[PDB]
Amino acid sequence: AITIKHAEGETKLDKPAKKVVVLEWVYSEDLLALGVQPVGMADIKNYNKWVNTKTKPSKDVVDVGTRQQPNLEEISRLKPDLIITASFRGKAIKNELEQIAPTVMFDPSTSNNDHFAEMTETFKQIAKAVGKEEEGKKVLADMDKAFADAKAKIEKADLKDKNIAMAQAFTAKNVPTFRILTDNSLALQVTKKLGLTNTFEAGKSEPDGFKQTTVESLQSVQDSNFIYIVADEDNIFDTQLKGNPAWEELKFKKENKMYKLKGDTWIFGGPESATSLATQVADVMTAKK
Amino acid sequence: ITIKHAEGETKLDKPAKKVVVLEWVYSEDLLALGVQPVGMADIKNYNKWVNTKTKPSKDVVDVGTRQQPNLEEISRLKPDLIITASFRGKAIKNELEQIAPTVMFDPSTSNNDHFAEMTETFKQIAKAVGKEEEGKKVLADMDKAFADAKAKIEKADLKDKNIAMAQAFTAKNVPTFRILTDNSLALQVTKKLGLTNTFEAGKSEPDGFKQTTVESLQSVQDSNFIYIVADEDNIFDTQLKGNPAWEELKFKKENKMYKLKGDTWIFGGPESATSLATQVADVMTA
Numbered sequence: 022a023i024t025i026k027h028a029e030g031e032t033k034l035d036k037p038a039k040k041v042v043v044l045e046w047v048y049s050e051d052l053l054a055l056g057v058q059p060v061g062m063a064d065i066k067n068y069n070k071w072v073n074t075k076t077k078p079s080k081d082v083v084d085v086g087t088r089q090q091p092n093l094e095e096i097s098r099l100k101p102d103l104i105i106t107a108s109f110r111g112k113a114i115k116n117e118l119e120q121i122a123p124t125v126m127f128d129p130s131t132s133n134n135d136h137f138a139e140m141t142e143t144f145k146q147i148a149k150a151v152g153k154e155e156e157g158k159k160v161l162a163d164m165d166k167a168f169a170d171a172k173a174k175i176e177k178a179d180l181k182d183k184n185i186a187m188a189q190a191f192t193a194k195n196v197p198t199f200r201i202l203t204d205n206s207l208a209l210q211v212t213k214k215l216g217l218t219n220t221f222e223a224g225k226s227e228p229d230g231f232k233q234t235t236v237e238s239l240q241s242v243q244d245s246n247f248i249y250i251v252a253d254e255d256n257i258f259d260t261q262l263k264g265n266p267a268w269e270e271l272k273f274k275k276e277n278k279m280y281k282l283k284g285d286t287w288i289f290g291g292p293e294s295a296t297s298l299a300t301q302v303a304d305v306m307t308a309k310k
Numbered sequence: 311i312t313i314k315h316a317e318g319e320t321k322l323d324k325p326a327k328k329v330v331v332l333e334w335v336y337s338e339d340l341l342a343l344g345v346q347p348v349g350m351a352d353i354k355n356y357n358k359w360v361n362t363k364t365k366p367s368k369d370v371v372d373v374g375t376r377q378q379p380n381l382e383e384i385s386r387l388k389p390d391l392i393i394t395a396s397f398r399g400k401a402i403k404n405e406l407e408q409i410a411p412t413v414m415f416d417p418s419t420s421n422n423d424h425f426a427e428m429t430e431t432f433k434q435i436a437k438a439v440g441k442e443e444e445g446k447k448v449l450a451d452m453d454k455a456f457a458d459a460k461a462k463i464e465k466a467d468l469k470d471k472n473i474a475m476a477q478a479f480t481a482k483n484v485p486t487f488r489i490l491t492d493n494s495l496a497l498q499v500t501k502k503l504g505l506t507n508t509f510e511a512g513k514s515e516p517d518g519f520k521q522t523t524v525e526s527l528q529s530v531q532d533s534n535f536i537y538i539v540a541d542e543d544n545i546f547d548t549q550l551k552g553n554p555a556w557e558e559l560k561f562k563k564e565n566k567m568y569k570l571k572g573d574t575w576i577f578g579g580p581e582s583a584t585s586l587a588t589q590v591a592d593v594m595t596a
Contacts, residue, residue, distance in 0.1 A: 087549075089484060089523070089524075089549060089553070090549060090552075090553050090554075109525050110525055110555075112525075112528070113524070113525050113528065113554065113555030114554045114555060117554065193481050193482060194479075194481060196377060233521060235377075236401075237397050237398055237400065237401055240400055240401055264378065265377075265378045266401060266402050266405065267378075267401035267402065270401075
């Protein structure tokens with residue numbers, strides 16, 4: 022009678038789930054980190070393209086459909102014993118998914134935001150729901166060593182400016198869009214473990230961990246280091262900015278304080294995405310010393 | 311002439327006569343007074359998305375996108391005065407002042423409350439061009455247009471005067487909603503028409519809205535829903551015509567939804583504001 026505490030409260034499970042359906046990428050990456058293959062999964066194609074962690078979904082999992090509109094018909098057809106989704110897009114159809122199986126719902130702002138705290142608590146609660154409580158802390162102890170070795174390269178390769186600003190970038194309706202992350206976000210919570218300091222919007226936190234805006238907002242952090250992920254086909258990203266003085270004459274671009282990570286890095290992911298981000302930051306920024 | 315704008319102060323020795331506009335709300339402000347700019351950004355869908363009744367002639371020349379106006383053409387226009395948003399001009403502020411006196415506004419100078427900054431930017435632009443008397447005209451007609459509106463919604467009494475407004479469109483083919491907040495220009499207008507917004511209540515977004523998806527509409531399920539599709543219409547009901555969390559919304563299957571016209575630029579000036587008023591009062595009563 023294992024007991025799962027999630028955002029929307031409590032859902033008891035008789036036995037650890039073996040046939041599980043995941044309706045968000047973070048929760049899917051969590052189950053795959055625990056060596057558990059789902060039975061259904063939303064948006065697998067663009068998960069393999071944009072999350073792209075080391076434990077990929079197997080072909081035996083079916084595409085449930087879009088994360089926006091899960092195909093309720095073919096969730097039931099698989100008779101899962103546990104459904105995991107975000108409470109944001111779960112309460113929308115909570116009764117309709119609870120009637121297939123016990124349903125658990127997590128929300129990134131469950132512990133004063135701190136999306137890293139909520140990321141780990143949700144990841145362990147999923148390990149307990151799946152019976153992989155020991156495979157859980159191995160995955161998480163591995164991430165703690167990774168944040169240590171990343172921090173190690175930051176001090177033996179010394180720089181003065183510990184200041185950085187991070188953004189996830191894409192193109193939307195033909196304008197380069199920036200999700201500039203704030204203190205409470207998971208990705209900047211990782212960078213703080215490496216001794217870095219985010220300069221975007223100070224002690225202000227946004228409940229979703231970023232501000233979605235345009236290149237014009239980059240002026241306020243233009244003196245810091247810029248780390249960004251282009252989670253879109255980036256050939257258009259530069260083309261829409263290559264003639265733009267808001268982008269070209271930005272101070273960290275002139276001083277080559279720009280560090281473009283790979284678009285592969287899903288900053289809203291779980292433990293495998295947090296390790297990859299950490300060691301990516303340590304290697305791009307300590308490539309000069 | 312000395313003006314007051316978001317990025318400091320500027321002084322015009324003579325009332326402006328040869329103006330370049332880089333944002334639509336200030337285009338509408340400029341045209342609503344009877345003064346034609348010499349250059350303006352993005353005419354075609356400006357006339358499509360704002361579609362102000364005083365239209366820009368072909369005497370005005372398109373100096374590029376609001377996002378990136380190719381500043382060579384604006385230079386060869388030798389303007390009397392340049393208007394843009396401080397948000398869009400801060401990155402290039404230097405390059406403009408090399409060309410002509412540049413002044414820049416931002417919806418936040420009135421501690422947001424985007425209605426207050428709109429009308430005050432209007433009077434400041436009126437003082438710049440020297441058409442202060444026309445300014446009083448356009449503003450007074452607006453307050454009256456608000457009164458007839460405000461009067462119509464009570465000649466038919468109503469209880470659930472809770473509204474929720476949103477600008478909607480598709481993005482990465484996800485139905486996206488710009489659900490407006492209490493300090494937006496739009497909700498300040500309906501506030502004085504007798505309606506009360508229910509989305510995020512006593513909270514202020516500096517943008518006057520929150521960009522989100524369908525799921526956020528549950529928070530204002532019990533209110534009246536007012537929206538404008540800033541996107542081609544058949545595209546709008548892209549993924550919602552059969553989508554729960556849109557179907558089981560209380561205001562839908564009870565048809566407490568009222569759809570404004572697509573060319574209702576809720577981020578515009580006084581005439582866009584009046585148009586908002588009389589529209590809401592129209593479809594609310596219906």
